[PDB]
Design a protein around this ligand. Structure first.
Ligand SMILES: Nc1ncnc2c1ncn2[C@@H]1O[C@H](COP(=O)(O)O)[C@@H](O)[C@H]1O
Ligand SMILES: Nc1ncnc2c1ncn2[C@@H]1O[C@H](COP(=O)(O)O)[C@@H](O)[C@H]1O
Ligand SMILES: [Ca+2]
Ligand SMILES: [Ca+2]
Ligand SMILES: [Ca+2]
Ligand SMILES: [Ca+2]
Ligand SMILES: [Zn+2]
Ligand SMILES: [Zn+2]
Lengths: 12, 743, 746, 12
C-alpha cells in the first residue's frame, strides 16, 4: 500500500 | 498516554516531511501519514482518543502500522505523568524511557559527611537531590562529602564498604577546585586506597611538611569557597548521582543497553579559579594492599624470568604514537603518575624536538626544593618519538621508586654466600674515597658524586632477587641498589639507587636491551672522560641519514658548532658523544648514545644535545639556575682538549662499525649478554614493572661496568684503556679527571 | 584588623621555616622572626595588639620591617569585614586583596531575560548573585536566553554598541550550558559577529527554517533537570563575579592578577556526556553591525599586490606553525571547522589522514540536506603534522569561498563590459549537445557533479565580480556565480554553480595562488587521460631519492593491494600523476585514484599517493554493504578489466626522476610568475580572485584559467579534444560520442 | 642584622 510504504526514517 | 520522544521538537513541513529536532541529534520522518499523526503524539493523547481526531481521515490499521514502525525504530515511548516535560526530556536524551526513569528515582540514597563539612551543606545536597525526585534515607549508593580526598576517615569508610559490598561516591564541593567522583564499586573499580596511593605521591610539598612536622594525618586547604562554587558543586553532584541511580536500575533489568558515562572509576576536577574541567581515570591496583593482593611482586621477583621472541619494525616492536595512546591515561596530576607532558619545541623548528614531563621525599626546604626540580626530558628525531621518550622516562622513574612490596629477604652476605653480590662490585668507590668520605662530599659541586658509607657485612640487610641472564639463575643485590629511595639506617647508608641501567619498553626484552645499552653508554663515557682520552670525530656524511648534516647546519645559524666523538670500547658496541659550543660564554653541551645500530647511537647523542643545549641557550647566562650551570658559564674548550677530536686520527665512518643486531629484540639481547660474557661480565635484571602501570620497566646491572660519576675504584676504569692500547700504561687515581662529568 | 592571605594555611616548623599551603600554590618563608610573628597574623589581631603579646621578645621597629616585606610581596593583607573568610579566600587565591574585592562587588548588575526564559529562572540567578555579594537592578547587563539566535538579541546588541554597554549572554536551560561571551563594544566581537558563525554551523535547523517558506530561530532546549539549571545559573554567578572584579583590579594594581574571564570566549558544558570546551569569538572587521561591510568590495577592485616569499617543503612556514596559528577556528560554535580528527591507525606510521567537519551551505529539501552534511573535508600527507594542516586548511578554504553577500560585485550586461568581461562558457566548457538535452541528462545522472546548467542569457544584466589577471596585469570579470559557492540565482537563469576548481588556501597569497594553479593542472591532466582513455606510462618510484615511495609500495602489498603511478603530464609540462591502487582478493577490486601536480615531481607523486592513502585504507576494512561513499557503485562493480587505461602502458618506458626537469626556484612568488608564463604560451589567461576573509586571516583565492579542463563530464570544444593530438598521443581527435561514458568517480 | 638578613620568601 502506497500510504504505508513510503514511510522512511533516518538520522541527520 | 503516547508521545514522540520528549527531547525532540516536532516540526511538520506539510507535503511529506516531519523533522524531529533535538539539541544534540536530529532526525527526519518522511511520509504523508506522519504529518497527520505526529501533531497528536505530544503526550496528551491516548491511542484510542486519536481516532475521532482523524476517523475517516485515516483508518486505524494504517495508524497501528505507523506506531509499531515508529516504536521498534526508537522514536515512540509512553508518557510518565510523574515527571515534568523538561525532566523527561533529559532522561530520554540519554535513551531512557520516562516510566523507567521514574521508578529508578524512587531508590533512596545515604549521605555521610567527613572532615569539616557543615551540617547545612549536607542539607543543601539533600535539597538539591530532593528537587530532582531523589530522596535521602536516615542503600544502593552512599555519597560521601569531604574537604580533602586524604581525610583518614575515608580509610575506615573504604574498608567497611569493601566488606559491606557497598557502592559509594566521593565529592569535594569546597575550595577553588571541585572534585567529583569516583563512584567506588567494590570488586569492579579500584578502592579509595588505589586512589590514595597516587594522591600521596602527587602531593610532595604537603607530604614533606607532614614528615617535617611528625619528626618533631593530612592538611586541609579547601578554604577558598564562594556560595556559588559550593552550590555549583552540590548541584553538579546531584545530577551525576541521579545518572548513576538510573544506570544501576536499568542494568538489573537488562545488563548493557545503557551507554552514557558515569563517574565509576572516574574523577572530574572543575577548577573555578582558572576554569577547566578534566576527566581522570582510576586504575584498580592489582597489588593494592586493601582491595587487591599485594603479594604479586614478591612472588614474581623469585620466579624465573620468562623471555620469548619479539618481532621488530626504530628498533621497537610497536610505533611510538601507539605507545602514547595506550599509556596516556597515566598523565594526570590526580590519578596519574606523570603530572603533564609539554612541548617546548618551537614549531618553527622541525628538527629540534624536546618534551618536558612532570614529576620524591624530603625532610627540609633545601631537600624539598631539590625535589620538584626533578623532571624527565623527551628526546628524539621525531616529535612523536620525542613525545614517547618523555612520557616513558617519567614512568621509568616512578616504577623504580621503592613502595614496600618489592621482592626481598633479610639476611647477611654470608648466609647467601655465592649467590649474593657485594654492592662494592656495583658502586666501585675507592678506599681513598671511602676514607675521606665526609670531606669529599662537603667539597662536591653536584650530589650525583655522593660517596656512601662503607658496607658492613655483619649486618642482615634486605636482598632482592635478580635474574642472571648469563648464568640463567637468581642472584642477589642489596635492595638499596635495586630501587630508588629505599630507606636505610643513618649509621649504615651504604648506597642510593641510581638511574643507571634503568629503562622502559613495550616489552620486557625491549627494556633489557635499552637498559644494557644505557650501561654501555655510561661505561664508555667514563673511560673517555676520567682518563681524558683523545678520540676521533665521526664523519656524519658517510652515514646515510641526512638529519645529521641538516642539524649541523642549524647549529651554525644559531651561533654554534657540533661534532661527534667515538667512545666505543672493549665491548665493541657503537658508543658516541656529541659536543657543541657557542662560537660567540661558550656553553659546552654533551650528549651520549649507545646501540648496536650506530646510526641510532649517533642519533641518541645528537638529540640529547638539543634537549640540553638550545633550551638553556635562549636564556641569558647570569639568570641560569640549572644544575650544570657553572660548567656552562666558566669552562672553556681550550681547557679541555679531550672534548675536541684528535686531528691526528682519521675520521670514523659507517663502514667502521659492523652490524650485530637482527630482526628479533630477544636475539639482540642474547647477543649483548654474550658480548658481556666474553669480557668476563655477568648480566643481571630486576623486573620493576608495576601491574597498575603496565609499561615494562627493568633495571639491568652488569657489575664492574663504570658510571660516569666520580667513582675511582680499581677495575675497568684503569684496565680497559690499556687492554685496547689507548694508553701505554694505566693512569693513577690522583691522575683521573678532577672535574666531574657535569651531565 | 591584620591578617595573612586567607586562602593560605599556615604551618610553623619551629626553628626556621614557615609554610603557606594553598589549593593551587605553595609558598615557603624562612626566618626565625617569621615563625614568631605569623602565628599572630590570622585576623585575630591589630598592629597595635601584636606588639604587647611579644613585647620584650621582638622589637617594635623589627616588626614593621617584617610587615613591610610581607606587603611588597603581597603575602600580607588587611581583613575586609564585609566579606566572610571563605569568600575573601576565593579572591586572595586569585591575588586580590579582600578590601579591594569588596569594593569591586559594589558595582551593580542588570538582568534581562529573552525568549522563553522563565521569570522564576531569572529570580534564581538574582538570588545566586546576591549570595556572593553582587547587587542587582551600569557595569554589566546580563542576558538569559534559550537560543543564541533569538531575534530579540539583535536589538539588544545594537543598543549596547550605541551605549557602549558591556554585557554577557547565557543559556542555562537544555542539556548543554552555554556561558558567554562578555561583549566589550570596541574590544570584542558583537553578537552579530558571533551570530554570523552560529547561522553557518546550524545546517539542519537553517534548512528547516526555509522550507517552511515552501508554505527567527527554533527553540531546542527542552532537557533540563532543575539541577542542571541551577548548576548553570550558579556557575554563571561565579563568572559574573570574576569579570566584575578583574575589571576593577586591572586598574588598581594593574598587572598583578592575571586569570581568564569570558571576554570574547564562549564556554559550553555538556551535562549529558560531561565535556567542557572553550570557544574563541573573533571580531569580524567586515561585520555589518560593528565593523565596515565595504572591505571586500573595496579590496576586490584594487590591484592584486604580490611580493617575494622565500621557502623553507615549498611553503613559507611549517605545518605545525600553520596549525598553531589557526587552531581557534576549530569550534562547532564560534568556529568554521566543526571537528578535526585523526582517523588513522597509529600502528601505521606511513598512512596519515584527518577528517575535518565542515559546515558548508544550506539546502531546501530533505534530499538536498543530506547532500550537505555528506560534505566533509579531509587531510592527506606523508607526515602527521602535514596531514593535520591539510585537513584544517581545506575546511577553511571551503568556508571562505561561500557567498556571504559582502563580495565585490557590480550589475551589468556582458555588452556593457566589453572585452573586460569573460563569457561563462569559456570556463564551464559544456557542449552544445549537453545544453540541448539538459533536463533529460540531469535527471538520469548518477552524480551531482554532472549537473548541466541553463545556457547563459547574455541579454540579462547579472552580477559581475572583478578578478585580477596575472598575465595581463589588470582586472577582468567573471560572473559572480562562478567565483563563490552558493550564489543565489533566479530559477529561470541558473547558468552556474560555483565549483571547487582552482580554490586553495595558504599562509600567503602567493603560496595560495601557486597551489591553486596546480589544482587546475591536475584536473586538466586527469580530464585528458580519463575521457580520451589514454594509456599512460608508469613511474619508476625507485629512481627518486625518496624511500617513502618504496616503503609505501611494500605496505600495500602486505594488505591485498598493488600500487602504481601513471604520468599524466600534458602540454604545460608540469609533472602530474595518478596514483592507482586495487585489491587482489575479494568480490570487489575497489579501484581507487589519487592525483597530484607540482613543479617538483616528488611532491607531485607525494600528493597523489597520499590521496590514495586517505581514500584507500578506510574503505577496505568496511564491508560492501556498509559502504555508502559517493564512489560506492564504483568500488564494488568496477574491475580493472573494464578500464585498461588505469593500468600502465607496457609499450612505453618507465618515467624516472631524470625525466622531469627542474623549473621551480627558491621563491614562491617566482614560481607563481613561472606558472603564469607557462599558461601564457599555451595561450591562456590566468585570473585570481582573493577570497580571503579578515576574520579568518588564512589566505584563500580562486585561480581560474579559462579553457582548462576538469574532472567532470563537460565535453565542449577545447583542450579535451585537441591537446592529445598536439602531443602525439592521438593521431586524430575523438568525437564527443567516443568520450568516456563512465564519470570520474572521485 | 642576621634575623633581618635571612628573611626569605619563595614559591614552589
Ligand atoms: N617508543 C617507545 N616505547 C617505549 N619506551 C620508550 C619509547 N621511546 C623511549 N622509551 C623509553 O623512554 C626512556 C627514555 O628514552 P631515551 O630518551 O631515548 O633514553 C627509556 O627508558 C626508553 O626505553
Ligand atoms: N602547511 C600548509 N599551510 C597552508 N595551507 C596548506 C598547508 N597544507 C595544505 N594546505 C592547504 O590545504 C588545502 C588542501 O591541501 P591538499 O589536501 O594538500 O590539497 C589546500 O588549499 C592547501 O593549500
Ligand atoms: Ca634513562
Ligand atoms: Ca639518555
Ligand atoms: Ca582544494
Ligand atoms: Ca586533492
Ligand atoms: Zn585498592
Ligand atoms: Zn560585529
Amino acid at each position: 500500500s502506497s500510504q504505508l510504504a513510503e514511510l522512511s526514517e533516518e538520522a541527520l | 498516554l503516547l508521545q514522540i520522544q520528549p527531547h525532540f521538537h516536532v516540526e511538520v513541513i506539510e507535503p511529506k516531511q516531519v523533522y524531529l529536532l533535538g539539541e544534540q541529534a536530529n532526525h527526519a520522518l518522511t511520509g504523508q501519514l506522519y504529518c497527520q499523526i505526529l501533531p497528536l503524539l505530544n503526550g496528551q493523547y491516548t491511542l484510542e482518543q486519536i481516532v475521532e481526531k482523524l476517523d475517516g481521515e485515516v483508518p486505524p490499521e494504517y495508524i497501528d502500522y505507523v506506531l509499531e514502525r515508529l516504536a521498534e525504530k526508537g522514536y515512540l515511548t509512553e508518557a510518565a505523568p510523574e515527571l515534568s516535560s523538561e525532566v523527561a526530556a533529559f532522561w530520554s536524551e540519554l535513551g531512557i524511557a520516562p516510566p523507567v526513569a521514574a521508578e529508578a528515582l524512587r531508590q533512596p540514597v545515604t549521605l555521610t559527611p567527613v572532615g569539616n563539612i557543615s551540617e547545612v551543606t549536607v542539607a543543601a545536597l539533600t535539597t538539591a537531590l530532593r528537587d530532582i525526585g531523589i530522596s535521602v534515607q536516615t542503600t544502593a549508593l552512599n555519597v560521601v562529602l569531604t574537604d580533602d580526598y586524604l581525610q583518614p576517615e575515608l580509610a575506615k569508610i573504604n574498608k567497611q564498604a569493601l566488606e559491606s559490598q557497598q557502592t559509594w561516591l566521593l565529592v569535594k564541593p569546597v575550595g577553588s577546585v571541585l572534585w567529583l567522583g569516583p563512584v567506588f564499586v567494590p570488586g569492579k573499580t579500584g578502592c579509595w586506597d588505589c586512589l590514595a596511593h597516587r594522591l600521596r605521591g602527587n602531593r610532595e610539598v604537603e607530604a614533606s611538611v607532614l614528615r617535617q612536622k611528625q619528626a618533631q594525618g593530612c592538611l586541609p586547604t579547601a578554604r577558598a569557597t564562594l556560595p556559588s562554587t559550593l552550590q555549583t558543586g552540590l548541584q553538579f553532584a546531584a545530577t551525576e548521582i541521579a545518572k548513576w541511580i538510573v544506570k544501576y536500575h536499568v542494568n538489573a533489568t537488562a545488563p548493557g543497553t545503557v551507554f552514557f558515562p558515569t563517574l565509576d572509576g572516574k574523577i572530574i576536577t572543575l577548577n573555578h579559579s582558572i576554569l577547566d574541567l578534566k576527566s581522570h581515570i582510576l586504575i584498580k591496583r592489582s597489588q593494592c594492599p586493601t582491595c587487591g593482593d599485594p603479594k604479586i611482586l614478591q612472588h614474581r621477583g623469585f620466579e624465573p624470568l620468562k623471555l620469548e621472541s619479539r618481532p621488530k619494525q626504530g628498533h621497537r616492536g610497536t610505533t611510538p604514537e601507539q605507545t602514547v595512546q595506550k599509556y596516556q591515561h597515566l598523565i594526570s596530576p590526580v590519578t596519574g603518575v606523570v603530572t603533564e607532558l609539554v612541548r617546548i619545541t618551537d614549531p618553527a623548528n622541525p628538527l629540534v624536538h624536546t618534551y618536558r614531563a612532570g614529576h620524591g621525599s624530603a625532610t627540609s626546604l633545601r631537600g624539598l626544593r631539590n625535589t620538584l626540580k626533578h623532571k624527565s626530558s623527551g628526546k628524539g628525531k621525531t616529535d612523536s618519538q620525542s613525545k614517547a621518550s618523555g612520557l616513558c622516562e617519567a614512568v621509568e622513574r616512578y616504577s623504580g621508586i621503592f613502595q614496600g612490596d618489592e621482592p626481598r629477604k633479610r639476611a647477611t652476605l654470608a648466609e647467601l654466600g655465592d649467590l649474593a653480590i657485594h654492592p662494592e662490585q656495583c658502586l666501585c668507590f675507592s678506599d681513598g674515597q671511602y676514607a675521606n668520605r665526609e670531606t669529599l662530599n662537603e667539597q662536591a659541586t653536584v650530589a650525583h658524586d655522593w660517596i656512601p658509607q662503607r658496607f658492613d657485612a655483619s649486618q642482615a640487610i634486605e636482598w632482592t632477587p635478580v635474574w642472571s641472564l648469563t648464568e640463567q639463575t637468581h642472584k642477589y643485590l642489596p635492595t638499596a641498589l635495586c630501587y630508588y629511595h629505599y630507606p636505610l639506617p643513618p649509621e649504615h647508608r651504604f648506597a642510593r639507587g641510581d638511574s643507571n641501567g634503568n629503562a622502559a619498553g613495550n616489552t620486557l626484552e625491549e627494556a633489557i636491551l635499552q637498559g644494557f645499552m644505557e650501561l654501555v653508554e655510561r661505561d664508555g663515557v667514563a673511560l673517555w672522560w676520567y682518563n681524558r682520552l683523545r678520540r676521533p670525530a665521526v664523519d656524519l656524511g658517510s652515514f646515510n641519514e641526512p638529519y645529521f648534516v641538516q642539524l649541523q647546519q642549524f647549529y651554525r645559524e644559531n651561533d654554534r658548532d657540533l661534532w661527534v666523538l667515538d667512545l666505543t670500547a672493549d665491548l665493541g658496541i657503537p658508543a658516541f658523544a656529541g659536543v657543541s659550543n657557542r662560537k660567540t660564554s661558550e656553553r659546552l653541551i654533551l650528549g651520549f648514545g649507545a646501540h648496536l645500530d650506530p646510526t641510532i647511537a649517533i642519533l641518541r647523542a645528537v638529540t640529547e644535545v638539543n634537549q640540553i643545549g638550545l633550551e638553556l641557550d635562549k636564556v641569558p647566562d647570569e639568570n641560569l639556575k640549572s644544575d650544570a650551570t657553572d660548567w656552562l658559564i666558566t669552562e672553556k674548550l681550550a681547557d679541555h682538549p679531550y672534548l675536541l677530536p684528535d686531528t691526528t686520527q682519521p675520521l670514523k665512518t659507517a663502514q667502521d662499525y659492523p652490524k650485530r643486531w637482527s630482526d628479533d629484540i630477544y636475539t639482540d639481547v642474547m647477543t649483548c649478554v654474550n658480548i658481556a660474557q666474553q669480557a668476563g661480565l655477568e648480566t643481571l635484571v630486576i623486573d620493576q614493572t608495576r601491574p597498575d602501570i603496565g609499561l615494562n620497566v627493568v633495571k639491568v646491572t652488569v657489575p664492574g661496568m663504570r658510571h660516569f660519576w666520580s667513582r675511582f675504584g680499581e677495575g675497568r676504569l684503569y684496565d680497559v684503556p690499556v687492554k685496547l692500547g689507548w694508553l701505554d700504561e694505566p693512569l693513577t687515581e690522583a691522575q683521573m679527571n678532577p672535574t666531574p662529568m657535569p651531565f
